[PDB]
Amino acid sequence: MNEASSKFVDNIAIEKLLNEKLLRVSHRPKNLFYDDEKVFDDLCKCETDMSKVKLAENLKRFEFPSFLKTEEYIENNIVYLYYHPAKDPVCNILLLHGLYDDNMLNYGFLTRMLNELKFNVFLMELPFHFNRKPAESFFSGEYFISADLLRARNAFIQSIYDIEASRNLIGNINTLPCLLVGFSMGGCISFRYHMLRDSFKGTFLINPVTDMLLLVWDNPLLVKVKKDLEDSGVGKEQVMDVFRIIDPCENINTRFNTDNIAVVYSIYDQIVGEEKNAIFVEKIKKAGLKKILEYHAGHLNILRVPKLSNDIYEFFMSCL
Secondary structure (H helix, E strand, O other): OHHHHHHHHHHHOOOOOOOOOHHOOOOOOOOOOOOOOOOOOOOOOOOOOOHHOOEEEEOEEEEEEEOOOOOOOHOOOEEEEEOOOOOOEEEEEEEEEEOOOOHHHHHHHHHHHHHHOOOEEEEEEEOOOOHHHOOOOOOOOOOOOOOOHHHHHHHHHHHHHHHHHHHHHHHHHHHOOEEEEEHHHHHHHHHHHHHHHOOOOOOOOOOOOOOOOOHHHHHHHHHHHHHHHHHOOOOOHHHHHHHHHOOOHHHOOOOOOOOOOOEEEOOOOOOHHHHHHHHHHHHHHHHHHEEEEEEEOOOOHHHHHHHHHHHHHHHHHOOO
């Protein structure tokens, strides 16, 4: 892709998101009490109850209970999972989208191309997004990252339990192997799930978010979330702390498989930027990841890039 073109896509999407959405709402931090001690000890144990699954159809959608209820936000306690089956499939992909996404159709080029390479694609809705959005929320994803930091922290945690649920579900549909694929924030989430659980053949991150500690302080989409917090007397250190347990790099010294995880980043990426990527890259090398691919794209336009499907296929087929 072209440089200036890629930069333009990213920048007008930032501006639209800020102006139509993120600058029009406001949120309070509330109770910053949390215990990190046992946060994923359940995770291996959880099992999707097949009696409580539903399948809704023109286009196919599994619905099932999220293992983590949020009683306040009733619409979010169901996970939705869009089934895009391949003809003669070799593998399942579980595909997670980015933050504040509100348009499933942006993933169709990828979904299709992967479907041609003989992948089933399951696309999971992230907590507080799409049909998981609470009716009082102004837009898809608002409640996921807002100055309600405990809610943000719990939404990230929930996503991880939802991957598990989705995985367990998928295991009952067929016995094919599974890949976890995460775009942007879905990438950061998938990274964390990978460290916690060896339930996928491998994991492929696509222009992931690189650091949840600093995300709110530096990411330009989050400029008013930071302000909300600064006016509430919440400082940098508190924010970093609340996200420590959910951040991949912060926990990167744990015991996990570093051979079956591939990462793509994009050199024109305006959302993440080149500095955060260079830091992310250095830290993931120091931990022993190898499959790292530079793309000549920005953050969003990469979803329309043909090569992406092919690298995911190479990765499925590679030495792990």
